[PDB]
């Protein structure tokens, strides 16, 4: 019960890390491309 | 019980990914700024 609530909050945590990781990958990709284009 | 111990260890895992993600965001930000300044 509280155990299920933990797991749900962990799932919210995870989805936040997924969000950050996709932000970072797009941003690093845009930098690599910029350097390549230069 | 072992179930709770799993969730705790998963929580430690998560906090480690949060640490890495903040390191990476500061570092990518410093690179973007460097390129902008150049």
């Amino acid at each position: 019960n509280n155990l299920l609530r933990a797991i749900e909050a962990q799932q919210h945590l995870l989805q936040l890390t997924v969000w950050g990781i996709k932000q970072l990958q797009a941003r690093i990709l845009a930098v690599e491309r910029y350097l390549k284009d230069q | 019980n072992n179930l709770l111990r799993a969730i705790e260890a998963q929580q430690h895992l998560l906090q480690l990914t949060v640490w890495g993600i903040k390191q990476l965001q500061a570092r990518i930000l410093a690179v973007e700024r460097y390129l902008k300044d150049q």
């Binding site: 509280n2 155990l3 609530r5 933990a6 909050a9 962990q10 919210h12 945590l13 936040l16 969000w19 950050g20 | 709770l4 969730i7 705790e8 929580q11 906090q15 949060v18 903040k22 965001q25």
Partner: peptide, 24 residues
């Protein structure tokens, strides 16, 4: 969402989880 809102949501849910771990 911004990285400031992200930082805060992270902390909010880290706190919730830690209280759910003690309650259990």
């Amino acid at each position: 969402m911004t990285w400031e809102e992200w930082d805060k949501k992270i902390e909010e849910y880290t706190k919730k989880i830690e209280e759910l771990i003690k309650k259990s």
